[PDB]
Design a protein around this motif. Structure first.
Motif, PDB file in Angstrom:
ATOM      1  N   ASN A 159      60.335  77.411  53.788  1.00 20.66           N
ATOM      2  CA  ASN A 159      59.542  77.748  54.970  1.00 20.66           C
ATOM      3  C   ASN A 159      60.331  78.639  55.936  1.00 20.66           C
ATOM      4  N   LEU A 160      59.887  79.854  56.247  1.00 24.88           N
ATOM      5  CA  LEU A 160      60.682  80.649  57.193  1.00 24.88           C
ATOM      6  C   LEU A 160      59.778  81.374  58.173  1.00 24.88           C
ATOM      7  N   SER A 161      60.336  81.912  59.249  1.00 22.89           N
ATOM      8  CA  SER A 161      59.489  82.697  60.155  1.00 22.89           C
ATOM      9  C   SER A 161      60.139  84.054  60.440  1.00 22.89           C
ATOM     10  N   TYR A 162      59.250  85.010  60.707  1.00 20.15           N
ATOM     11  CA  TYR A 162      59.723  86.362  60.999  1.00 20.15           C
ATOM     12  C   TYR A 162      58.901  86.983  62.128  1.00 20.15           C
ATOM     13  N   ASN A 163      59.339  88.160  62.511  1.00 20.51           N
ATOM     14  CA  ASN A 163      58.772  89.034  63.505  1.00 20.51           C
ATOM     15  C   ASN A 163      58.785  90.464  62.963  1.00 20.51           C
ATOM     16  N   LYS A 164      57.660  91.162  63.027  1.00 22.78           N
ATOM     17  CA  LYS A 164      57.502  92.506  62.496  1.00 22.78           C
ATOM     18  C   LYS A 164      58.291  93.581  63.225  1.00 22.78           C
ATOM     19  N   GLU A 165      58.767  93.314  64.428  1.00 22.02           N
ATOM     20  CA  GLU A 165      59.564  94.261  65.171  1.00 22.02           C
ATOM     21  C   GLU A 165      61.044  93.926  65.088  1.00 22.02           C
ATOM     22  N   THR A 166      61.417  92.644  65.051  1.00 16.13           N
ATOM     23  CA  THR A 166      62.829  92.307  65.054  1.00 16.13           C
ATOM     24  C   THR A 166      63.453  91.858  63.748  1.00 16.13           C
ATOM     25  N   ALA A 167      63.397  90.579  63.383  1.00 15.19           N
ATOM     26  CA  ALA A 167      64.106  90.114  62.196  1.00 15.19           C
ATOM     27  C   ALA A 167      63.631  88.756  61.695  1.00 15.19           C
ATOM     28  N   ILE A 168      64.493  87.946  61.078  1.00 17.08           N
ATOM     29  CA  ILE A 168      64.118  86.643  60.563  1.00 17.08           C
ATOM     30  C   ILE A 168      64.561  85.574  61.555  1.00 17.08           C
ATOM     31  N   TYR A 222      59.238  90.080  53.933  1.00 20.86           N
ATOM     32  CA  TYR A 222      58.912  89.491  55.212  1.00 20.86           C
ATOM     33  C   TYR A 222      59.888  90.061  56.254  1.00 20.86           C
ATOM     34  N   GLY A 223      59.324  90.617  57.335  1.00 19.58           N
ATOM     35  CA  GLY A 223      60.213  91.150  58.369  1.00 19.58           C
ATOM     36  C   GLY A 223      60.386  92.654  58.277  1.00 19.58           C
ATOM     37  N   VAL A 224      61.344  93.229  58.996  1.00 15.17           N
ATOM     38  CA  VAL A 224      61.466  94.688  58.926  1.00 15.17           C
ATOM     39  C   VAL A 224      62.279  95.195  57.740  1.00 15.17           C
ATOM     40  N   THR A 225      61.751  96.153  56.977  1.00 15.49           N
ATOM     41  CA  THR A 225      62.552  96.668  55.866  1.00 15.49           C
ATOM     42  C   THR A 225      63.269  97.955  56.280  1.00 15.49           C
ATOM     43  N   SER A 226      64.352  97.757  57.027  1.00 17.32           N
ATOM     44  CA  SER A 226      65.102  98.872  57.561  1.00 17.32           C
ATOM     45  C   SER A 226      66.568  98.567  57.787  1.00 17.32           C
ATOM     46  N   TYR A 246      67.197  93.055  53.646  1.00 17.94           N
ATOM     47  CA  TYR A 246      67.785  94.114  54.449  1.00 17.94           C
ATOM     48  C   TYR A 246      68.564  93.521  55.623  1.00 17.94           C
ATOM     49  N   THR A 247      69.734  94.060  55.878  1.00 22.52           N
ATOM     50  CA  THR A 247      70.526  93.623  57.030  1.00 22.52           C
ATOM     51  C   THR A 247      70.589  94.808  57.986  1.00 22.52           C
ATOM     52  N   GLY A 248      70.510  94.522  59.279  1.00 22.96           N
ATOM     53  CA  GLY A 248      70.513  95.584  60.273  1.00 22.96           C
ATOM     54  C   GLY A 248      70.949  95.167  61.661  1.00 22.96           C
ATOM     55  N   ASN A 249      71.053  96.197  62.493  1.00 25.44           N
ATOM     56  CA  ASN A 249      71.481  96.034  63.880  1.00 25.44           C
ATOM     57  C   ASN A 249      70.287  95.799  64.794  1.00 25.44           C
ATOM     58  N   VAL A 250      70.225  94.662  65.472  1.00 26.45           N
ATOM     59  CA  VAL A 250      69.175  94.360  66.425  1.00 26.45           C
ATOM     60  C   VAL A 250      69.858  93.924  67.722  1.00 26.45           C
ATOM     61  N   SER A 251      69.548  94.615  68.811  1.00 23.61           N
ATOM     62  CA  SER A 251      70.140  94.394  70.121  1.00 23.61           C
ATOM     63  C   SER A 251      71.655  94.320  70.032  1.00 23.61           C
ATOM     64  N   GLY A 252      72.319  95.214  69.300  1.00 23.54           N
ATOM     65  CA  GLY A 252      73.744  95.241  69.141  1.00 23.54           C
ATOM     66  C   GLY A 252      74.387  94.192  68.262  1.00 23.54           C
ATOM     67  N   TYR A 253      73.622  93.368  67.583  1.00 25.23           N
ATOM     68  CA  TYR A 253      74.052  92.303  66.722  1.00 25.23           C
ATOM     69  C   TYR A 253      73.732  92.607  65.260  1.00 25.23           C
ATOM     70  N   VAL A 254      74.541  92.106  64.318  1.00 26.07           N
ATOM     71  CA  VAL A 254      74.127  92.326  62.927  1.00 26.07           C
ATOM     72  C   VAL A 254      73.390  91.090  62.412  1.00 26.07           C
ATOM     73  N   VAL A 255      72.164  91.269  61.954  1.00 20.84           N
ATOM     74  CA  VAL A 255      71.269  90.203  61.563  1.00 20.84           C
ATOM     75  C   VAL A 255      70.536  90.525  60.262  1.00 20.84           C
ATOM     76  N   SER A 267      73.719  81.110  59.308  1.00 22.19           N
ATOM     77  CA  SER A 267      73.831  80.970  60.753  1.00 22.19           C
ATOM     78  C   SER A 267      72.677  81.646  61.464  1.00 22.19           C
ATOM     79  N   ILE A 268      72.126  81.010  62.492  1.00 25.44           N
ATOM     80  CA  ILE A 268      71.020  81.551  63.252  1.00 25.44           C
ATOM     81  C   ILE A 268      71.299  81.455  64.743  1.00 25.44           C
ATOM     82  N   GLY A 269      70.988  82.515  65.461  1.00 31.21           N
ATOM     83  CA  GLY A 269      71.119  82.501  66.945  1.00 31.21           C
ATOM     84  C   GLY A 269      69.696  82.897  67.394  1.00 31.21           C
ATOM     85  N   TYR A 270      69.578  84.126  67.910  1.00 33.19           N
ATOM     86  CA  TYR A 270      68.219  84.583  68.228  1.00 33.19           C
ATOM     87  C   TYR A 270      67.511  84.799  66.893  1.00 33.19           C
ATOM     88  N   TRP A 271      68.189  85.543  66.017  1.00 30.42           N
ATOM     89  CA  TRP A 271      67.781  85.848  64.661  1.00 30.42           C
ATOM     90  C   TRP A 271      68.782  85.307  63.635  1.00 30.42           C
TER      91      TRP A 271
END
Ligand SMILES: CO[C@H]1O[C@H](CO)[C@H](O)[C@H](O)[C@H]1O
Lengths: 16, 133
Positions: free
Chosen positions: B16-25, B96-100, B71-80, B119-123
Motif C-alpha cells: 500500500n503506498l501513496s503518491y502525489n503527481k507533482e512531488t513524489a512518493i 506511480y508519481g512523477v517520472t522525471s 525514478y529518483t530526483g530533486n524535490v525542494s533541494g532534497y533527493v527523494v 526512510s521517509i520525511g516529507y517524501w
C-alpha cells in the motif's frame, strides 16, 4: 552472530 | 527523514503506498507472508498530507514481483524517490508519481523480494530491498 542474514540491494534515492 | 527497516519475511501479499503527481512518493506499508500466514508490517507515514493512496494486492503465491523500477530526483533541494513501478509475472502496476530525474531498475532473473527498508520525511528519501531464494 545469533541473527540470520539475507542479501540486501540499494539504497536508491538520497545518500547514506 | 525517519528511517525504517521491515526485515525479511517469506513472501509479499499486499503493498500500500501513496503518491502525489507533482512531488513524489509519501506513505509506504506492506502486508508480508509469514510461513503461510499474513503479517502486517508497520505503516511508514509521511510527515505531511495530500497524497493519493494505491493498493496493490498480489494473488500470492501464484503471483509475485519480477521487476521493480522507478525514478529518483530533486524535490525542494532534497533527493527523494519520485516514481515507482512494480511488475509481476501477471501484470504491471505503475508508474506511480512523477517520472522525471534519474531512472533505476532491478529486474530479478531468479529469486524473490522478501523485505524492504528505507526512510521517509516529507517524501520517501531512499529505499533498499531484501532478496532471497
Ligand atoms: C523537508 O524536510 C523533511 O523531508 C525531507 C524530504 O523527504 C527530508 O527527509 C528532511 O530530512 C526532512 O526534514
Amino acid at each position: 552472530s545469533g541473527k540470520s542474514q539475507t542479501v540486501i540491494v540499494g539504497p536508491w534515492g538520497a545518500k547514506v | 527523514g525517519k528511517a525504517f527497516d521491515d526485515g525479511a519475511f517469506t513472501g509479499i501479499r499486499e503493498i500500500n503506498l501513496s503518491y502525489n503527481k507533482e512531488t513524489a512518493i509519501g506513505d509506504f506499508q506492506v502486508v508480508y507472508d509469514l510461513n503461510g500466514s499474513p503479517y502486517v508490517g508497520q505503516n511508514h507515514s509521511s510527515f505531511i498530507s495530500g497524497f493519493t493512496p494505491v493498493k496493490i494486492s498480489l494473488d500470492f503465491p501464484s503471483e509475485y514481483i519480477t521487476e521493480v523500477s522507478g525514478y529518483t530526483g530533486n524535490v525542494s533541494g532534497y533527493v527523494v524517490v519520485r516514481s515507482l513501478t512494480f511488475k509481476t509475472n501477471k501484470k504491471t502496476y505503475g508508474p506511480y508519481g512523477v517520472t522525471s530525474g534519474t531512472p533505476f531498475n532491478l529486474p530479478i532473473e531468479n529469486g524473490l523480494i522478501v523485505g524492504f527498508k528505507g526512510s521517509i520525511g516529507y517524501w520517501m528519501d531512499y529505499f533498499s530491498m531484501y532478496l532471497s531464494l
